[PDB]
């Protein structure tokens, strides 16, 4: 019964190990770096057609097909170049807050306030998009069942857990436990061997997909972490929270490097994404604006223009050419 | 594969989206909230790991889609953002259990002061009034044990034209209604209105009480959109 203070003794060994390596700051090393400049971006396409609030988008790996979910109970697959509607999938649940596109391109996933991740088959011989699996077994809602490895999915929320379903069998292979609050966002690494995960207990946790262990945890924020996104080399990640701040952690130093905050901003971050190079940190906010942050200088390089409601989803395409922003005004917009 | 035949597909999809906009704008969404002691499942059954239950019912050619939530965690500050742009919230309280009636007040206060539910009206269904009368006619358990300000409460002038009952049933049930409207006024603006009702176990008028109160919420959505306020 001596465990409650030996745990706090361990958590001071971690803070003494993290402060022994903080010899400098990311603001000090990048003081002699030339700034990026004012980034004017223009709305190139505006994809209309959703009847209700858009909650999630995801690009394809071809950098041309978007999928988008909305609260009417429909997924729409868009052609980004020609503003075309490829598919219109009517869902069984109206309440869906995650969507996915498989990196092969054959599958889309969706999940929501029903506790199921629904995998859909796009390359069906019969010509219609049929549901392939209804992955049930996750007590509580599904926030980011939205990342496929290749034919195994990773799911995140509700029971404060993350899972590693096998789509062929329809059962859980690894349950990731260790978050106290509801788990809001996950980001897979480029190598698909690690994934970082953010919850409403103000902590982000690295997990190993093969072993099933939480090998690191990051406790820097002050409120619920709503969005998470890996750096393009998988050594860093970014978290946006309800405290109007974005923070850049590092996996090899195991601490927080830079905080992206402004005194004008008082609204929480709903969506974070990086550029292809890692210099830009695009963040969507509770008000109707997206900000472009320099990830090396903590400076607002620019601002994406207006939606009429809350910017809810944001994703930079795999070629790095476009930035797609979807909001609660039923409109997706493709930026450049 | 000619690109002109892909625009004919994209125009045929939009014709299906516009004839699904007609059944989306015409239907009225609702949200049931309440604890387990509140007779919430009885209201669903008297109308005509699954994380959401849906119930459709028509009252005079108007479709209502209730969304009884279940199989969720205790904290609800994250999925309540999903139920912005709903027509109402049907909050059901058990009136009998006065020990758990105070946590129904702090639960109602968290809804009414929510950042994402600032424009949404609440239709309170004060439930099990057949069980509250027996707990004040028998007089064993009494409300002023838990609230210090019941003895300084008297029934107002215009109150409850009942067919016949006790005046302490009317005095108590107007006190339970009084704290709920007190949160509806002091911690809120004139953007959304609470609508208190009194409901028994078997009651075939709950579908009419929702229709009459949702005829009123749409009337104040129109009086502000047409700027007639």
């Amino acid at each position, epitope marked *: 019964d001596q465990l409650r203070q030996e745990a706090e003794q361990l958590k001071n060994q971690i803070r003494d190990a993290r402060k022994a390596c903080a010899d400098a700051t990311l603001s000090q090393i990048t003081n002699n770096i030339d700034p990026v400049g004012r980034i004017q971006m223009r709305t190139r396409r505006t994809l209309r057609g959703h009847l209700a609030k858009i909650y999630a988008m995801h690009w394809g790996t071809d950098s041309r097909l978007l999928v988008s979910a909305s609260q009417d109970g429909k997924l729409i697959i868009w052609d980004s170049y020609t503003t075309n509607k490829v598919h219109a999938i009517p869902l069984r649940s109206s309440w869906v807050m995650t969507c996915a596109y498989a990196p092969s391109g054959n599958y889309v996933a969706c999940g929501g306030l029903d506790n199921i991740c629904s995998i859909y088959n796009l390359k069906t*011989r019969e*010509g219609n998009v049929r549901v392939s699996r209804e992955l049930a077994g996750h007590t509580g809602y599904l926030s980011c069942c939205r990342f496929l490895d290749d034919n195994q999915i990773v799911t995140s929320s509700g029971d404060t857990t993350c899972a590693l379903w096998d789509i062929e069998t329809g059962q859980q292979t690894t349950t990731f436990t260790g978050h106290t609050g509801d788990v809001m966002s996950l980001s897979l690494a480029p190598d698909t061997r690690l994934f970082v995960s953010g919850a409403c207990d103000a902590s982000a946790k690295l997990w190993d997909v093969r072993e099933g262990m939480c090998r690191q945890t990051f406790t820097g924020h002050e409120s619920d972490i709503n969005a998470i996104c890996f750096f393009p080399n998988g050594n860093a990640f970014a978290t946006g929270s309800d405290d109007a701040t974005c923070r850049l952690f590092d996996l090899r130093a195991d601490q927080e490097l830079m905080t992206y905050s402004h005194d004008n901003i008082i609204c929480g971050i709903t969506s974070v994404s990086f550029s292809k190079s890692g210099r830009l940190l695009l963040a969507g906010y509770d008000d109707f604006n997206c900000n472009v942050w320099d990830a090396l200088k903590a400076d607002r390089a620019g601002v994406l223009a207006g939606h009429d409601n809350r910017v809810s989803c944001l994703g930079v395409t795999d070629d790095g050419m476009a930035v797609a922003t979807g909001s609660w005004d039923s409109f997706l917009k493709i930026w450049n | 594969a000619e690109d002109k035949a892909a625009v004919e597909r994209s125009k045929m999809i939009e014709k299906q989206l516009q004839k699904d906009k007609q059944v989306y704008r015409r239907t009225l969404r609702l949200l049931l909230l309440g604890a387990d002691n509140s007779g919430k499942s009885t209201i669903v059954k008297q109308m005509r790991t699954s994380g959401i239950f849906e119930t459709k019912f028509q009252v005079d050619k108007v479709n209502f889609h209730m969304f009884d939530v279940g199989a969720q965690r205790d904290e609800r500050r994250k999925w309540i953002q999903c139920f912005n742009d709903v027509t109402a919230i049907i909050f059901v309280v058990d009136s009998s259990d006065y020990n758990r009636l105070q946590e129904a007040l702090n639960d109602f206060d968290s809804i009414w002061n929510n950042r994402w539910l600032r424009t949404i009206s609440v239709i309170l269904f004060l439930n099990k009034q057949d069980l509250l009368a027996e707990k004040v006619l028998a007089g064993k358990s009494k409300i002023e044990d838990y609230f210090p300000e019941f003895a300084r409460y008297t029934t107002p002038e215009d109150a409850t034209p009942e067919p016949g009952e006790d005046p302490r049933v009317t005095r108590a049930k107007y006190f339970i209604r009084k704290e709920f409207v007190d949160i509806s006024t002091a911690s809120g603006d004139g953007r959304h209105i609470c609508y208190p009702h009194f409901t028994c176990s078997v009651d075939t008028e709950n579908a009419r009480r929702i229709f009459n109160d949702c005829k009123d919420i749409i009337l104040q959505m129109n009086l502000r959109e047409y700027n007639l306020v």
Partner: single-chain antibody
Amino acid sequence: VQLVESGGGLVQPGGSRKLSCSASGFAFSSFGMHWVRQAPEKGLEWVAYISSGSGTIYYADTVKGRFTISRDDPKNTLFLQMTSLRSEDTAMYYCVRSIYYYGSSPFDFWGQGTTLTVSDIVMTQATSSVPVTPGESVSISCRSSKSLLHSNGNTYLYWFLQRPGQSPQLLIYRMSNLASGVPDRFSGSGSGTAFTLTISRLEAEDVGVYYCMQHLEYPLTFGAGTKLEL
């Protein structure tokens, strides 16, 4: 997936005959439908077309004004009403489906065919008969009048194969893309006017008549057909 064609038979010229095509096992209303005729010991020829929703109906010039194509999506059937039959209408009329979105595979499934016997970009195959023993590399070339490279980057060229006593099946649909159910022996390259279908190792089911088809301009003109015999 199945497309059974009905109607057909012997018609004295000057009369009329309606054809039918009962679809089963796919979503018929989301597929465009074509008709492709095949005269005895000749090549293929495109006849008519009706799109999904019956909004676009396009005909060839040899059947325009005389042939009428319709569909009935609740009964999942496809019609071709021919009015004054000439003796150039003695053919086998196939009922090929096609879907049109980004990444689709049109002309993917064909029907059995009906034998009716009545009593533009020109695509030419460079050869007509190549006898090759099983196990060698075969190249089947074709050329076009106009370049098939549109401004969007695509090269609208569709390779086929008709085995003896069968319906044609699609092999390569946009000059480079293999179909579903086709092995990696079949490979296709091209440059805009010159096109080449290469078979790496040859089997016994690889014999038949190989066709090529453009999809830029809508009177879809085929090739003459290259026959591999063994």
